[PDB]
Structure 1
Amino acid sequence: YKSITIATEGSYAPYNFKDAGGKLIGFDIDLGNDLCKRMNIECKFVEQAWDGIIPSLTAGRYDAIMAAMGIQPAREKVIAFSRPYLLTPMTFLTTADSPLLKTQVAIENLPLDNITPEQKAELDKFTKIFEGVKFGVQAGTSHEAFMKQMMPSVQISTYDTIDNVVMDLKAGRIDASLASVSFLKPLTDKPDNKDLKMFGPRMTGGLFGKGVGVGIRKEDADLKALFDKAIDAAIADGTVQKLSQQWFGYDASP
């Protein structure tokens, strides 16, 4: 390896998005360039729509994916992942005036790896509150998978990008959403989004898997080993923690 092409969505702030000039920027872009410097590889970032991000990697259109991608079990069936470069729980989003905000949270930190009758009870409480409530999620995400598998009785609308979800929630076309704390905290910290609030349990595991990793082809064992070495070094020296505070406003490093 001498040069690699890394794909990113280009519409998932603060992980990957476009600045004023249209240049790809964000946590994934900064970390991508840092990791490649540690690996002694030339780094080229390309914009790719979420719909064909995994098949374009397997087809050989580029060598890696750094696009806020959760290491989820369904994805592991198709591609390989590096070591997680960020750890984030999942939570719900609504409006600041929404009665949903008054709901009691019995389990603050909800792991989904092995749902006990008590965790199922907390999940069912929310499902029942969420009936009649219009839900919005980005298509092809772990958010959609959670909603279809864990809360099937809840009506969901799928969107092209997360920016369309945010638009519709602010507009009043949808009542609530789901995404990670890493996306939602920078969003709710913005003064333009004082009308948006995070709520409910903070969920980990199950179909959300463990952390955000680099998407690599399964046969590219050597490229995975290189990224794993680079990621461990970037975490140990505090580079991931620095970029996490710089882009998310808190430490989400493993």
Structure 2
Amino acid sequence: KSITIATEGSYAPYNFKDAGGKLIGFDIDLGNDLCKRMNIECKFVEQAWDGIIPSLTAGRYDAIMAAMGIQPAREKVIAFSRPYLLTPMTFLTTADSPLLKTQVAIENLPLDNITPEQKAELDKFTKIFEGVKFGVQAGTSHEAFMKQMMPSVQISTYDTIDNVVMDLKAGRIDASLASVSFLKPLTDKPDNKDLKMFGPRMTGGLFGKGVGVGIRKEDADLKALFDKAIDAAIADGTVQKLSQQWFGYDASPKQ
């Protein structure tokens, strides 16, 4: 038994290339680890984003591991394994903003079945955000979360996240909300040490279920094999270990 897994190869640290052009990254290391548990051979191939789903349905390969968010639009065409990595979102402000002084009672905040303690934390931040100029990228889940969960907060919209960042550095806005995968490398750059992430690391709700293995709907047995492998990889700490290695934070889901 052997499967071909498609990835982008242009989305570091999920899937990208080494100096020799070989596919590397979290998706590649996890894909190989999952296939090893499944006792199946693994081959990674490159596929441009626009054709990644049609080429799966055309049968060019058996699965997709390309930081693909499990979402209703994709679920209309393909099936997904259980999530293999969460997609945390967090807030961004300037270094020395008073917003950094706000104590974070719960670091990880899953939004789906919000506990009274979790809701109290989200209300506490929403309260402070009342007097803060907020900026968000238009058409994103970040804009949706602010419009649905934080109506008490004034928001301005931008075409790109780079433009949100430029206006925060210019002082036109005081804070933002974006993905940790974008914000962590951004704030790690010496030229951006005047910026800081803060607040809860949120997942679920409007932010989706996380990333999953894209599989043809008919391949029920392959999804079952992937689900068993993912649960075993979460259970033994492999997902957590690879998450820390590739991202510098733990985005592993619950088993």
* Same fold per superposition (TM over 0.5): yes
Higher mean C-alpha displacement, 16-25 vs 182-191: 182-191
**Compared CA separation, residues 201 and 32, structure 1 to 2 (3 A):** same
Equivalent positions of 1:34-49 (< 5 A) are 34-49=33-48
**Compared CA separation, residues 110 and 44, structure 1 to 2 (3 A):** same
Higher mean C-alpha displacement, 120-129 vs 5-14: 120-129
1:190 aligned residue:
189
CA contact (8 A) 2:70 2:212 kept: yes
**Compared CA separation, residues 78 and 121, structure 1 to 2 (3 A):** farther
Q: Aligned Cα RMSD in Å?
A: 4.5
CA contact (8 A) 1:70 1:142 kept: no
Secondary structure in structure 2 of the residue aligned to 1:87: coil
Q: CA deviation at 1:247?
A: 1.3
Q: CA deviation at 1:81?
A: 1.3
Higher mean C-alpha displacement, 98-107 vs 197-206: 98-107
Structure 1 distance, partners of 2:104, 2:167, is 26
Structure 2 distance, partners of 1:113, 1:165, is 27
CA contact (8 A) 2:3 2:62 kept: yes
What per-residue deviation string (whole Å, max 9, x for no partner) do you get for residues 81-134 of structure 1? 112222342124466588997999999766544799999999999999999999
CA contact (8 A) 2:136 2:142 kept: yes
Secondary structure in structure 2 of the residue aligned to 1:250: coil
The structure that has the greater radius of gyration is 2
Higher mean C-alpha displacement, 2-11 vs 98-107: 98-107
Structure 2 distance, partners of 1:46, 1:171, is 42
CA contact (8 A) 1:11 1:163 kept: no
**Compared CA separation, residues 122 and 249, structure 1 to 2 (3 A):** closer
Structure 2 distance, partners of 1:13, 1:196, is 22
Q: CA deviation at 1:37?
A: 1.6
Q: Tell me the matched-pair count.
A: 253
TM norm structure 2: 0.68
Higher mean C-alpha displacement, 238-247 vs 42-51: 42-51
CA contact (8 A) 1:95 1:175 kept: yes
Structure 1 distance, partners of 2:12, 2:93, is 18
What per-residue deviation string (whole Å, max 9, x for no partner) do you get for residues 129-162 of structure 1? 9999999999997668768988999999999999
User: Structure 2: 5+ residue runs without aligned partners?
Assistant: none
CA contact (8 A) 2:88 2:203 kept: yes
Q: CA deviation at 1:171?
A: 11
**Compared CA separation, residues 223 and 176, structure 1 to 2 (3 A):** farther
Q: CA deviation at 1:29?
A: 0.8
**Compared CA separation, residues 153 and 24, structure 1 to 2 (3 A):** farther
User: Structure 1: 5+ residue runs without aligned partners?
Assistant: none
**Compared CA separation, residues 89 and 177, structure 1 to 2 (3 A):** same
Higher mean C-alpha displacement, 157-166 vs 244-253: 157-166
Higher mean C-alpha displacement, 143-152 vs 76-85: 143-152
Identical pairs, percent: 100
TM norm structure 1: 0.68
Higher mean C-alpha displacement, 108-117 vs 229-238: 108-117
CA contact (8 A) 2:86 2:203 kept: no
Structure 2 distance, partners of 1:150, 1:39, is 41
**Compared CA separation, residues 157 and 62, structure 1 to 2 (3 A):** farther
